[PDB]
Design a protein around this ligand. Sequence first.
Ligand SMILES: Nc1ncnc2c1ncn2[C@@H]1O[C@H](COP(=O)(O)OP(=O)(O)O)[C@@H](O)[C@H]1O
Ligand SMILES: [Mg+2]
Length: 705
Amino acid sequence: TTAKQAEAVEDSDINPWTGQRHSERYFKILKARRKLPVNKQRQEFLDLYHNNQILVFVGETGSGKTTQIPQYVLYDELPHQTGKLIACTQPRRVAAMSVAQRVADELDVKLGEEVGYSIRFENKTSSKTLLKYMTDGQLLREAMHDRDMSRYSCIILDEAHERTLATDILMALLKQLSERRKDLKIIVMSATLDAQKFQSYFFNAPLLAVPGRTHPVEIFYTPEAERDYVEAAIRTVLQIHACEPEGDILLFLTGEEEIEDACRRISLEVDEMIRESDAGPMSVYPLYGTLPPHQQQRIFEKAPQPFRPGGRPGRKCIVATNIAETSLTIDGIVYVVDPGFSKQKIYNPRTRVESLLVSPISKASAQQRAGRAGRTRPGKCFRLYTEEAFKKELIEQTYPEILRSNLSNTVLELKKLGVEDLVHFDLMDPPAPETMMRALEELNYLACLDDDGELTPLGNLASEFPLDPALAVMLISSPEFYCSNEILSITSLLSVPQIWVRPANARKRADEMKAQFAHPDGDHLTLLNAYHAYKGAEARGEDMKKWCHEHFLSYRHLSSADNVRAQLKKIMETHGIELVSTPFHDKNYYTNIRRALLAGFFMQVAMRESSNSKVYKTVKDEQLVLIHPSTTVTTPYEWVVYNEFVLTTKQYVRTVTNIRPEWLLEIAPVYYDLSTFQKGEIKNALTRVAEKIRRQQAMKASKAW
Ligand SMILES: Nc1ncnc2c1ncn2[C@@H]1O[C@H](COP(=O)(O)OP(=O)(O)O)[C@@H](O)[C@H]1O
Ligand SMILES: [Mg+2]
């Protein structure tokens, strides 16, 4: 129970968890581990853990705080083994999976056995699991079925400073739960030191702070901004690899596509650089949210060394998103390239505009990025933006995600959790009252709540799905349109990255191939066609990776979509939701699907303003939009249902499907209650089609007597 006793247990020959003998790797890694900053304060941790129910832990990135602390807890409760588990929550998937693998290696056990991870649609655990690294959202969803979280004896909320939505809701739930369950330990971990609010919130909880031990980082700035930050970044990476000593490079970018393309171009220009120059070898690794486990783990490979000793220093380049900002640490990094951008989620209430958007980072973010370089040795950060700009463009911190998000899912989850008074829920930072209200009416239109604010059977059923309320409701309602299977496929496809691949060498081909999958009526149906082609090839016995390459489709994203589809399907079967399909010979096959979309996306509809323009106008928001140029639809109809709302230089809607206005009035009578529309073109059009519907009811057949 004391620190040295725990160490002596760790030092033993046999593995206490598996009854097998420890490997040499285990002792190598152990001896390595005990050099970490958190180690020398282990005892001080244990004390604080032994005398307190709730504890606040604060340390810099690279301390050991995520990999070591759960293990400290594990070995501490080892002598009196409890039947419950240890949960560590990471706001980022990749962090959870990667760290799970690491701690698996440190405990000398198989991943998914004693140490396991839990992500939405990705479960690497079993009955053997004592330590689970999960996404905070995943734990939040577990709480909905288990309000007291009876399977956990200790819960470690990690990376709390990121102030994500699920983390905050979890903090509230756990504050309220610490009063009921005194047998539950709670450890809140952070990187930013200002956790006095965390203390005050959790009944003045104690604080353990690890002294920062980062080496000095020298910060470099450009003279004047460079418009295209990507090639700036690439030329920077090249200039470093050619004109600097030993070390590894951390290059921050925005998303998957940018990262892959940049990796490829860097690889090319480095390859040519080898044949012509003094520059040594350089391996390049991508790092982003959707990346599969193997490719995640490949970033921890060590750099290649020169062809001949004494010169040509070789190295690694990690082209990562802001995951590498604070969530995880890579050793060997000495240089950091910071273009100053990240993909941030923004939400405007009034305009109802929810969107992902590449935007300027925060001052705090910038400082973290710079900080990573000076861990092992003193390092330098190349910031592409100007110093003056740094000083006065950059917001000082990224505001709480709660403050900038759609709270429909949140309110649904809270209702499922039993919260009967939302506007008093003791969250750390209460959301804007009008925003949460908007969540309430959005839930009202989906018929997930009754007039008493309680869950509709449909709402309760919707909470059982790992989906946004709209998507969930669409899926659940689909049997009424006699196309549940197809809507399942489409839900799955909508829940994974885009499936299209467009390599630089084969663009014209790729595009054309994409066009071959195109359905005339909409993008959802195009996705459906591609997926069906994929399943046909799979059934036929084809090599699906080769088939996907050959057809310019992402095998990763498609297989992922199939995984998601499987899980959603068995959730559907559990709760008695019918799986039905219209015979393809029927003329209503596609119309049933297009209509089925309106069950969940009746609020994301736009109307073409005139024939003299390609401009569409959203319903009840009066937002001017264009159909995104990445459409398989060559003939957009007057009315469209869109899935996404992206903002670049112009406001786009993405993944649109042609619909008939009558369907809006039929499937969505309450929301398209015409008397609740403002004066304008949309109201007039819908009025005309309504009056048209009345003419249609020419029949006077019912009269009986
Ligand atoms: N997947 C991994 N493979 C090898 N080493 C790792 C891995 N993840 C983290 N580490 C090491 O563990 C140390 C502590 O980092 P970690 O505990 O993951 O996060 P935190 O910064 O919260 O402590 C780092 O110095 C890093 O070198
Ligand atoms: Mg960590």
